[PDB]
Design a protein around this ligand. Structure first.
Ligand SMILES: [Cu+2]
Ligand SMILES: [Cu+2]
Ligand code: NA
Ligand code: NA
Lengths: 621, 621
């Protein structure tokens, strides 16, 4: 059995039993995060040691613990008590989400604000949002959630169409207490509904769409062994699942001849952040770190056949832990299929008379998560030609507000009285690189303009330069689309047949990075998001670009702390962190449910192979 | 019958008969371009007037003519004799291409250069390339092609693997005369073959690929009436074909309710250019304008079922003219199919309990052309949600050279002794805009960073600004990926229900533009390629960004001449020209046949609709 196998329902039960016995899994305890740790560097030969990391919360108010357990041996390995005013809170628990609306329902200041607006408290939904760190001194050390109100007219109604602006509450969901209710003014609650399944809003449905039928009469070309190890068209990898990061890709390698060559050791989306750009005091605190604060894999959808995934689909059903250590299955949470991808290569040669066409294919590994109004798809793509691509698909319902009658520079209007504040969705990809092994380096490649003159008499020449990043303090880079800037990850000790280092090139989309003022609270907590590319020396405890405890943590943790060590990264075991995201100015077409928008990155081989790696693909059947 | 119908074999025969009779289509004459002209503005009601533009070359040396004919009435409309030293030459003729290798075979300086290299003249292929304009005074007024040599070892051999460097010839293919042979030195002709169908190079073919079967058991969802008028999922357009531009899209419109709303009046790729970045005198003149000099639609492939186009395919077989006015069919030259495109919209709502998923689709219109070693696919995409996208796919065999033993800053090494000079592939899209009619304007939209302070106390705000382009002299714009720069085309006289102008947003890929020194010959001839975005006032005779006669024309023609008129474009009948392209640093994986690389642009609705235009799409079958 592979040490990268998915966690089992049996293993989850053992961890719960090991913690119960040890006295750490009491009845006031809650598991806020559970995941299997990755093997340590070099210990592949040999012996299992399935270890698990656990964050234990305490509903009574006591301090939480970080705990590691070995289930192959059966004991606790370490247990540490946390000072959360110091290192940040544990991730939000599912059961804390509803405490906010239920508490607020009996608070007098909140009842008072709803009565001024003539709203039946039983029709008011409260969205519980992460709190962040701002000026309120009484919140440091406290578990705080903030709450924004929407009206549901009837149980099937889309509450997002009726925001209650000028109102926000803050809640302590350990001591069950409403610290503040802030009421800045009454805004009309917008009246139109946004019910996208109502025949009155959709009109008659189309009858013009005829079916597309995608089938594989002989089955798919990939194999799955061991639960999660994939072999497809010379590719080899392990598909992991963590409750925080979601789908994680391990040991990506390509069979070149009869060498299995490594490419990436671990690939994940290790954080994301959603900052809002509305300076109103009702919303100027809202930023979520979906991955670090909420854990995106916990909210993975179960994907339906023919609706979410089309074709010959193979599913994985990852197991996570509920808040008491009971195993929970996410049935059909990961989809895997191959997809036709047009023409791979084509040439008709006049001089030889040979007409040559080959078709491309990709294999797709995806999952989809839902946190409140947002829906995010995560797609990994492997292509025949050695390309690796990631794509994020953002859909769902926009987060809404009132539209102020004067208009706004930070909000757009979707419908009469209804606004959608400006925001970004920013991702951090963490790529633990292993280009032909662990001795890797990063070069930055710029196009070079040349001046007309001697050596370049017709002024037609142009070139490129590569700059090696040698220390971590040099390795915080920004994009430059105008110079065609890319980054090459190479192995200086592994050469192709032309005696050049083997390499992969990273092509970014060059979207804007974090827009918030550099002195803001969000620029401190989401330092990673202010630059396109960071490179660190690998270390087992440096896993997330924002640190281990994102909820209510001050700034600084994560990447700006790692790179301060100024370690050697020239031909070393390195990690590339790529920031990319969407800047979302909502448009009318985004309402009342939004069409998918996409962002991503890709890596293409750059002299990794000795010639095209797809000469052996056959003429199509 | 629609006035945008494809030209017929009957109409081609009439134009040949009309020219013969008139005495303009002699026996020394050659048709170098023939195409149907677009209807004039406003003359839709009524009456046919199928007119055709013709460029007539003269093999004896006389001056060529530009000629327009009406075939519905049956006479010549105008005939004009051209001074080609003034306005540029006519496009290269197919039959001129081989005159270069056949002439050079009997030239003594060329025989002398091949003998020094021990090459059998019968094994030397000559690639005929456009000449451009450089320092040679004897070429102005002459029809000149330049010639670069490759060795074929046997009739099925890929000549591209064996360039003969240090050698070039120039040829006058009217007077049949080798003006110069330039021999700068002997280079070894690289020895390895590049035969990608040879079992010795491909090894054993894969047996692991299992079939993907894409079928539409009820047929496709689109209809074609009148030969070329398409209706699909509320979209309406006419698919035209011109021998110069290739697939041209007319009258793109969207049925919103029971209004047919126009979006784009004409869309085409109106030019492309391929500049090479190697300062060697053997190649420092090479730049091709595939569209303006060679006519890309003339070399369209016939697309095979299951190989080039997969699924339920409907073909168009456009008719063009050969060099004597005989109709020629391009069987299966245009492919049209619809394609599944993943998830369109998805949200699972906790508060209402509704789970909602819809799938996206796109309709694809494509053709593929082959000029010498290059193969280019042209893809137009229409999506359910109102998005329009163009994608160019570049494949084929790289253009090669010797790799100098010292190495090179402008060439990369593909194989022992074998180089591939750096180059770009740059496209110009011409979009004759008709957003809800012909009163349109262009705004440039930048993200706006805001400083922390009063009004923005937590430093989280950000905004956007729009700048209206009012005169043509203001409308030469460049990209700025760092500010998220996009361009919005709107109709200030057509408002959505929120009373804002309807609009479409142009999203560019922000790749580098023309790299050559601004004083170079290529920067003058390809002025369009030095900026990302140009906007002109519409005029019937302003069709190509490089002018009507690209071959051997001096610089200046086209866009920099049009915009000098400094016309009003604020709410007027306007044309957007978008430059986009690929900067190609060849890699080893590009050899010996290259995987497809892509570049493109898209346009998305920006408050064109009153809400999402895809609420009426049904749950999947
Ligand atoms: Cu958004
Ligand atoms: Cu190229
Ligand atoms: Na590494
Ligand atoms: Na126009």
């Amino acid at each position: 059995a592979s040490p990268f196998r998915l966690a089992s329902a049996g293993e989850i039960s053992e961890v719960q039993g090991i913690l119960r016995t040890a006295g750490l899994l009491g009845p006031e305890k809650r598991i806020a995060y559970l995941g299997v740790l990755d093997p340590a560097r070099g210990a592949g030969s040999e012996a299992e040691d399935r270890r698990f990391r656990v964050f234990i919360h305490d509903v009574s108010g006591a301090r939480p613990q970080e705990v590691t357990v070995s289930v192959t041996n059966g004991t606790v390995i370490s247990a540490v008590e946390l000072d959360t005013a110091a290192t940040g809170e544990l991730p939000v628990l599912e059961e804390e989400f509803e405490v906010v609306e239920q508490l607020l329902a009996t608070d007098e200041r909140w009842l008072k604000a709803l009565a001024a607006r003539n709203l039946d408290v039983s029709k008011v939904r409260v969205a519980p949002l992460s709190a962040g760190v701002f000026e309120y001194a009484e919140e440091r050390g406290r578990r705080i959630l903030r709450g924004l109100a929407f009206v549901q007219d009837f149980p099937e109604d889309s509450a997002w169409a009726h925001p209650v602006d000028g109102l926000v509450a803050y809640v302590d969901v350990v001591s069950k207490e409403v610290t503040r209710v802030i009421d800045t003014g009454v805004f009309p609650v917008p009246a139109e509904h946004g019910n996208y399944t109502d025949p009155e809003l959709t009109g008659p449905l189309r009858t013009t769409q005829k079916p597309i039928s995608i089938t594989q009469p002989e089955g798919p070309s990939f194999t799955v062994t061991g639960g999660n190890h994939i072999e497809w068209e010379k590719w080899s990898l392990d598909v992991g699942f963590d409750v925080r990061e979601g789908v994680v890709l391990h040991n990506i390698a390509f069979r070149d001849g009869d060498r299995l060559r490594p490419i990436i050791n671990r690939a994940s989306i290790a954080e994301m952040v959603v900052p809002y750009g509305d300076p109103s005091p009702i919303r100027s605190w809202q930023n979520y770190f979906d991955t670090g604060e909420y854990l995106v894999g916990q909210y993975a959808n179960s994907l339906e056949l023919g609706c979410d995934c089309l074709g010959d689909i193979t599913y994985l059903s990852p197991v996570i832990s509920d808040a008491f250590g009971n195993p929970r299955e996410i049935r059909n949470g990961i989809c895997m299929h191959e997809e036709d991808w047009g023409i791979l290569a084509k040439h008709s040669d006049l001089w030889s008379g040979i007409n040559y066409t080959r078709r491309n294919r990709r294999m797709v590994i995806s999952f989809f998560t839902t946190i409140g109004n947002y829906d995010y798809g995560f797609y990994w793509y492997l292509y025949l030609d050695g390309t690796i691509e990631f794509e994020a698909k953002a859909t769902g319902v926009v987060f809404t507000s009132a539209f102020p009658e004067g208009g706004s520079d930070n909000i757009s209007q979707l419908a009469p009285g209804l606004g959608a504040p400006f925001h970004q969705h920013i991702f951090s990809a963490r790529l633990d690189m292993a280009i032909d092994g662990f001795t890797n380096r990063v070069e930055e490649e710029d196009v070079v303009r040349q001046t007309m003159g001697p050596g370049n008499e017709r002024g037609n020449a142009f070139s490129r330069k590569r700059t090696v990043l040698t220390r971590e303090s040099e390795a915080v880079r920004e994009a430059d689309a105008r110079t065609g800037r890319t980054w090459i990850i190479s192995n200086p000790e592994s050469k192709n047949r032309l005696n050049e280092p083997v390499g992969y090139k990273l092509h970014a989309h060059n979207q804007p990075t974090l827009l918030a003022d550099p002195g803001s609270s969000i620029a401190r907590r989401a330092a990673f998001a202010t630059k396109d590319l960071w490179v660190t020396r690998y270390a087992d405890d440096e896993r997330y670009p924002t640190g281990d405890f994102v909820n209510q943590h001050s700034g600084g943790a994560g990447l700006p702390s790692y790179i301060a060590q100024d370690r050697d990264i020239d031909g070393q075991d390195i990690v590339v962190w790529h920031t990319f995201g969407l800047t979302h100015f909502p448009r009318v077409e985004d309402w009342p449910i939004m069409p998918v928008d996409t962002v991503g990155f890709k890596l293409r081989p750059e002299g990794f192979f000795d010639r095209s790696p797809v000469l052996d693909v056959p003429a199509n059947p």
